[PDB]
Structure 1
Amino acid sequence: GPPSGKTYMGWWGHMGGPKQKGITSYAVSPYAQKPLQGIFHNAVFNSFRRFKSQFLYVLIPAGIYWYWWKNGNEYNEFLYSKAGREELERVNV
């Protein structure tokens, strides 16, 4: 076929990575492993960890936005009640 453009990914046997040497991998058949039930006692306290490190990056921005929303809402409610019809004529137009 027609010549192909150079990419950053190849295929099995010429993936494009650097020459590997010295690394040795080991694995055991899924068939010889303990039937799915051991994901507790040993894999329970370890879990939830990948969210104790993150929740702050989510909670603070969330908190900031929740209070901002609640503030403006409660202010709106006041403006349209009887007590605030005076301030409403001030801030409105």
Structure 2
Amino acid sequence: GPPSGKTYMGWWGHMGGPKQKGITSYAVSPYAQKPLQGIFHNAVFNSFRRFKSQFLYVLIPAGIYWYWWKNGNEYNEFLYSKAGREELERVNV
């Protein structure tokens, strides 16, 4: 077939990054390691900072929208009761 266009990823042996020189890596077989050494030292301290260094970007927008919905629901409940009957004709104009 015809050759393709120019991309930003290749294949094994010609992947297309920069040239590497001076880096050594080491690894050990999984058959020679301890079986399942995580629930502790990861539920102790690791799985608390991973979201509570991030919790303030979620809960400030969540508290704004929950305050807005709860305030509007109590005002609709007041308007259709007996005590809020006089305001109801005023705001449906």
Q: CA deviation at 1:2?
A: 1.0
**As a proportion of its length, which structure holds more helix?**
2
Give per-residue Cα distances to partners, 1:18-68, cap 9 Å, x unaligned: 001111111111111100144314663222211011111000000000000
Any unmatched runs of 5+ in structure 2?
none
Say yes or no: does 1:53 pair with 2:48: no
C-alpha separation between the residues in 1 aligned to 2:43 and 2:80? 54
Deviating above 3 A after TM superposition, structure 1's stretches of 4 or more consecutive aligned residues are none
C-alpha separation between the residues in 2 aligned to 1:22 and 1:43? 37
Which range is displaced more, 71-80 or 22-31?
Answer: 22-31
Q: CA deviation at 1:78?
A: 0.3
Q: CA deviation at 1:91?
A: 0.9
Which range is displaced more, 78-87 or 44-53?
Answer: 44-53
**As a proportion of its length, which structure holds more strand?**
1
Q: CA RMSD in A?
A: 1.5
**Under a length normalisation based on structure 1, what TM-score does the superposition of the two structures give?**
0.91
Give me the identity figure in percent: 100
